[PDB]
Symmetry: C2
Subunit: 284 residues, 2 copies
């Protein structure tokens, strides 16, 4: 089963479809990654909505409160970033691939892709001849191998009959000339076989040349996809990369500052003035 075996070009043709399917796989892949990012963002948001509420209603006041409260903002900000990845993966990468797909494969009226049919017929036309001059070069192989086994009979039937009491000038003759319609026949086919075999090696270079034709045509098509894949993945890479986004760092620089603004004393001074000895008192 080598590429040259009549009809083994099927693998090359199979690749045109694999191409379209790989396009869909990659879309699903990026889509799944998008749903995941969105899920993380949504959770961070729920957490932020939930704890901003709980902290506000709880007995925590002052700068320590704000400090605590800054994390809800941090959570919400991270969420946004991840929704940007989701957006990028979807509106950019996903749509890009979806369009490349529709622009590279076209439906055949009957069903299937034109570029696949185009390659299928190309390989047929290019192999049609060499194959014909093989179906017979294969049939002339049986006509011979059927004699090189039919000859072992005229020699076998004359050895089994050579030892029998019911022999006659006739029965003994119906085995004599048979070793001719075989011996002189085997050579008769030994030429049929040997001929077409050389009647094939004179068209073999032509056959290879035509197959290279169609094949190169397929490599050109595959090349466009392989290259398109590299371009796309490089963009998806930059989309997922939050490790270099200055905006991401800003979130935490801001977070810290808030946490530092936390001034205990001031919070205590407040409590003394609004709930402690510092309050006004109209004595008796």
């Amino acid at each position: 089963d080598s590429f040259w075996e009549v009809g083994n070009y099927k693998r090359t043709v199979k690749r045109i479809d694999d191409g379209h399917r790989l396009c869909s796989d990659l879309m699903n892949c990026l889509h799944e990654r998008a749903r995941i990012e969105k899920a993380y963002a949504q959770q961070l948001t729920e957490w932020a909505r939930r704890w901003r509420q709980l902290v506000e209603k709880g007995p925590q006041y002052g700068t320590v409160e704000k400090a605590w409260m800054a994390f809800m903002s941090e959570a919400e900000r991270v969420s946004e970033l991840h929704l940007e990845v989701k957006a990028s993966l979807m509106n950019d990468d996903f749509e890009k691939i979806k369009n490349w797909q529709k622009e590279a494969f076209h439906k055949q009226m009957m069903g299937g892709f034109k570029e696949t049919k185009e390659a299928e017929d190309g390989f047929r036309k290019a192999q049609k001849p060499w194959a014909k001059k093989l179906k017979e070069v294969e049939a002339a192989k049986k006509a011979h191998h059927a004699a090189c086994k039919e000859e072992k009979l005229a020699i076998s039937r004359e050895a089994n009959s050579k030892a029998d009491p019911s022999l006659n000038p006739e029965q003994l003759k119906k085995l004599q000339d048979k070793i001719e319609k075989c011996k002189q026949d085997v050579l008769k086919t030994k030429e049929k076989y040997e001929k077409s075999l050389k009647e094939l090696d004179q068209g073999t270079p032509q056959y290879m040349e035509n197959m290279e034709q169609v094949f190169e045509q397929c490599q050109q098509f595959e090349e466009k996809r392989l290259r398109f894949f590299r371009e796309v993945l490089l963009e998806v890479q930059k989309h997922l990369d939050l490790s270099n986004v200055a905006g991401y760092k800003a979130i935490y620089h801001d977070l810290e500052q808030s946490i530092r603004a936390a001034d205990a004393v001031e919070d205590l001074r407040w409590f003394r003035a609004n709930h402690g000895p510092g309050m006004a008192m109209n004595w008796p």
Copy 2:
């Protein structure tokens, strides 16, 4: 409403109990955030496991199959950084608060922190000599404010008892005693409501003293907690920041590298040699 109003110290005392609850709230807050970080990593890990298989058993081959495989790596590595966040939030932040909480609030087996009573009883204590005298002054208030109306009750019995059928002198002669004896009381009563009111001011400066003495305790306790939130929050802030890890930038360098490593031309050669014309063929 004022803090100096007897028993209003309750608020300063309730703060103690609240301090315990805030430690717990902050714990669950970090805990939930941890759950979310783990969810994300969990999800990124399934995606990678799923797509490493789909690509391996898929028709994508060559350098491009690895540029694709490179995103599963990114997924697995981002995931680890996140299980690292959870690990910190739980093993470090949550536990740190969990120690500070328990070992700072001596919870008395029966029910109630020994730190609360310390202030509860301390307040009752400092507010006894005052709540005591106030009870005297108070009782000496509705007593005099009763003698002032006691005489004005009899004066309406003498001057308002002349239009009665034949007045009996034996009565008016002593009916004027009622209106008189009253002033003898509004003489002493007025002297008590005024004497006690001074016995009240001879303790006010001492009252406030003992009172602001306990407050300061409570303040300094609350201050322990507040400063502690500032310290533990600065630590959580760090743990959340993914930028704080070098390997983070290394993930997208390694991703980019692999992708760039994708070569169309190269990948094609391989196909031609493993499925195309390049293949070896033993001709007939």
